[PDB]
UniProtKB/Swiss-Prot annotation, chain B:
Homodecamer; each decamer is made up of two conformers of VP2, called VP2A and VP2B. 12 homodecamers assemble to form an icosahedral capsid. Inner capsid protein that self-assembles to form an icosahedral capsid with a T=2 symmetry, which consists of 120 copies of VP2, with channels at each of its five-fold vertices. This capsid constitutes the innermost concentric layer of the viral mature particle. The chain holds residues 1137 to 1185 of 1333 of the full protein. It comes from the Viruses. Belongs to the turreted BTV-fold inner capsid family. This is Inner capsid protein VP1.
Length: 49, 49
């Protein structure tokens, strides 16, 4: 076990293990859902709960 | 599968391409019931139009 920068002294250390994303994360292929609307707006349960 | 279809409400245009499409390829039988269609019966001379 070790100090733990922060939970220990103050020696600002200058080198860490930063974990990062391997490559851009927001590249195209934006989700897209198809929508079907009820076809009667008069036979729409609504009841229960 | 003998698949029975009663609402035929939601069911994406896409889910349908596939079932009708697979009735074919896999001998599936879909049984559709909220349709209402008259039914002419022309003789082998004016065969379909």
């Amino acid at each position: 076990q070790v100090g733990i920068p922060k939970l220990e002294v103050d020696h600002i250390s200058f080198s860490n293990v930063v974990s990062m994303m391997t490559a851009n994360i927001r590249t195209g292929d934006d989700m897209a859902v198809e929508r079907v609307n009820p076809d009667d707006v008069r036979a729409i349960n609504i009841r229960n709960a | 599968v003998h698949m029975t279809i009663n609402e035929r409400a939601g069911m994406s245009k896409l889910v349908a391409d596939n079932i009708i499409a697979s009735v074919i390829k896999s001998n599936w039988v879909v049984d559709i019931l909220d349709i209402e269609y008259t039914a002419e019966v022309m003789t082998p001379s004016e065969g379909y139009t």
